[PDB]
Amino acid sequence: MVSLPRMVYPQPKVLTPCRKDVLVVTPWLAPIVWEGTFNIDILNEQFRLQNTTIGLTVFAIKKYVAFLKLFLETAEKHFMVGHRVHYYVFTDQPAAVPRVTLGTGRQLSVLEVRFCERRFLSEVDYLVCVDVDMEFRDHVGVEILTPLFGTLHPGFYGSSREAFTYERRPQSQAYIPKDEGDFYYLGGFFGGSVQEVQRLTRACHQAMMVDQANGIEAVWHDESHLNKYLLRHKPTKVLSPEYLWDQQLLGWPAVLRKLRFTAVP
Numbered sequence: 001m002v003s004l005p006r007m008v009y010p011q012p013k014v015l016t017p018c019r020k021d022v023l024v025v026t027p028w029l030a031p032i033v034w035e036g037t038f039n040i041d042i043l044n045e046q047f048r049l050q051n052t053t054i055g056l057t058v059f060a061i062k063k064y065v066a067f068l069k070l071f072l073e074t075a076e077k078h079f080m081v082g083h084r085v086h087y088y089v090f091t092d093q094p095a096a097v098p099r100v101t102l103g104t105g106r107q108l109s110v111l112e113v114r115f116c117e118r119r120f121l122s123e124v125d126y127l128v129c130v131d132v133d134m135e136f137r138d139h140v141g142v143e144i145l146t147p148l149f150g151t152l153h154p155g156f157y158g159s160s161r162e163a164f165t166y167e168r169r170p171q172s173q174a175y176i177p178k179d180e181g182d183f184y185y186l187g188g189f190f191g192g193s194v195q196e197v198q199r200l201t202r203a204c205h206q207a208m209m210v211d212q213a214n215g216i217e218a219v220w221h222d223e224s225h226l227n228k229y230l231l232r233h234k235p236t237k238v239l240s241p242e243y244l245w246d247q248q249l250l251g252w253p254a255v256l257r258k259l260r261f262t263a264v265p
């Protein structure tokens with residue numbers, strides 16, 4: 001919104017597609033983020049000029065606190081480097097959170113569990129919610145930021161919708177029939193503006209309570225409700241599987257030029 005400065009980079013080629021092997025835009029014109037689709041220098045400029053702050057939230061309960069060290073250290077190496085970052089670690093074991101050295105402009109808050117959502121509105125511009133038993137292995141940056149985004153589940157990105165493991169019982173609020181659905185999104189990596197993320201979590205929480213009262217639990221719990229939400233409220237960006245992969249279970253296919261955030265080991 002202030003002007004970008006002069007920049008020298010390769011001219012985009014109107015008659016040369018970015019990738020010829022994958023879909024790079026959804027039918028509602030939301031970009032699908034794959035390596036090769038973005039110039040990170042231009043994006044870093046746009047977001048820095050807005051002095052963007054990104055909150056990264058993780059839930060580490062019981063034995064999962066053991067994954068915090070690697071998660072945070074690799075995040076320090078690959079997540080939003082150069083931008084303001086605020087980590088929010090929700091845990092039942094505050095004292096077990098490892099002492100990780102953070103780069104300038106980056107901070108960490110420990111929130112005990114078992115905090116007011118209005119705090120997020122005043123501290124960060126975007127929220128990124130991921131699982132803790134993971135590690136960053138490559139660049140995860142501002143190219144993912146947008147009002148609302150979901151990530152393509154690694155095991156279903158090439159599947160037909162009828163094969164998606166959506167909740168199929170009409171008694172559940174997460175219900176999605178066989179002739180509906182765009183993609184199968186992961187519960188472990190989603191985000192967007194604080195406002196949009198709060199809307200999504202508020203909708204999910206209410207939908208899960210209705211299911212509880214009706215004596216039913218969606219097949220894949222929160223992930224099933226996330227999928228129903230994103231089916232009805234289209235994400236403004238969709239992240240490719242590069243953003244959440246499991247190399248042990250899925251290897252390293254040619255269509256993935258980078259494996260950015262992966263399951264541990």
Ligand SMILES: [Hg+2]
Pocket residue numbers: 017018019036037038
């Ligand atoms: Hg391109």
Ligand SMILES: [Hg+2]
Pocket residue numbers: 057127128129197
């Ligand atoms: Hg979150």
Ligand SMILES: [Hg+2]
Pocket residue numbers: 201204205208222225
């Ligand atoms: Hg929920």
Ligand SMILES: [Hg+2]
Pocket residue numbers: 200201204205222225226229
């Ligand atoms: Hg949700």
